[PDB]
Automatic annotation (TrEMBL), chains A, B:
It comes from Methylococcus capsulatus (strain ATCC 33009 / NCIMB 11132 / Bath). The lineage of its organism: Bacteria, Pseudomonadati, Pseudomonadota, Gammaproteobacteria, Methylococcales. The gene is ccp. This is Cytochrome c. Residues 6-132 form the Cytochrome P460 domain. The keyword Zinc applies. Zn(2+) 3 binds at H69.
Length: 136, 136
């Protein structure tokens, strides 16, 4: 019933990135530069295959600094983690949702079984609750 | 004496990212969101090792659209490529420098055998001509 810390996620496939700056509706709490990562099982789902149990997607969120017409990555703020288990995470559409403050395994963030996470992700039912699209 | 197109670079290790906005000294031609990738051999150099022959670093540059204070990745503009071969690329400090327009193997951008690239990268002699640092 708990999402595993995704050890070694930084070596996985980089799906995409986006910057959320002040003024964006989502500045609280996903303000910053984020990078999405996918393990091999998640790549199968992202390609248009189905997501096997053990698929993991990571939302890696950094603070940034303005440095002379550059946004430079600062400290990690958190990671979001989606872990596929159709049975064990059936209450949240077959994905377990967890956050780790500063990406630390000991700073688990989710208190409601991931219902809040699932609430936003539910809009994406038709793409198996995943916003991110594989790009070249 | 030509740099090979780095086929499969998008499945490599994501080292780091940075946004270069309009007004930056380098806006022509590296304005946009860039992602740095390293093959296995390049990781050895980034971790504190000697860069072995066969090390490849890729600078993957995307256009972006500012959309309600989100910076959203658009089309790939180009990739920059550094390929380690101490003998073959001896004239430019053991790295071969090349650009591919839109990341296409047919669109070679370097016209001076990489002397201009080398000219900037030479400032980083003490880190084997590599600007990017491995981060967690
Ligand atoms: C809407 C108000 C959101 C809430 C609440 C949560 N997330 Fe989210 N998430 C959202 C968007 C619009 C995106 C796509 C970002 C992009 O660059 O395209 C995401 C992405 C993720 C990812 C990457 C996988 C994907 O679906 O694209 C993960 C792993 C993720 N989110 C986890 C997550 C968790 C654990 C949440 C509860 C703490 C959570 N999200 C809330 C929008 C929203
Ligand atoms: C200074 C005026 C530059 C010139 C001319 C070129 N590059 Fe560059 N490059 C520069 C900086 C400051 C950085 C680091 C970017 C970051 O996010 O920190 C880079 C990076 C690269 C990379 C990634 C590897 C690394 O050294 O960090 C590659 C593969 C790369 N650059 C290639 C490249 C080529 C092929 C050039 C000539 C066409 C070239 N660069 C010119 C600064 C400068
Ligand atoms: Zn200025
Ligand atoms: Zn703005």
């Amino acid at each position: 019933t708990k999402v595993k810390y995704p050890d070694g996620f930084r070596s996985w496939y980089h799906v995409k990135s986006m910057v959320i700056q002040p003024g964006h509706p989502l500045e609280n709490p996903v303000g910053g530069i984020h990078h999405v990562y996918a393990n091999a099982e998640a790549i199968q789902g992202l390609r248009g295959g189905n997501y096997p149990d053990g698929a993991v997607l990571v939302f890696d969120l950094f603070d940034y600094q303005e440095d002379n017409h550059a946004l430079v990555e600062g400290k990690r703020k958190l990671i979001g983690v989606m872990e596929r288990d159709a049975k064990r995470f059936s209450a949240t559409g077959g994905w377990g949702y967890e956050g780790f403050g500063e990406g630390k395994p000991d700073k688990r963030l989710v208190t409601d079984g991931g219902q809040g996470c699932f609430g936003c992700h539910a809009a994406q039912k038709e793409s198996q609750y995943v916003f991110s699209r594989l790009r070249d």
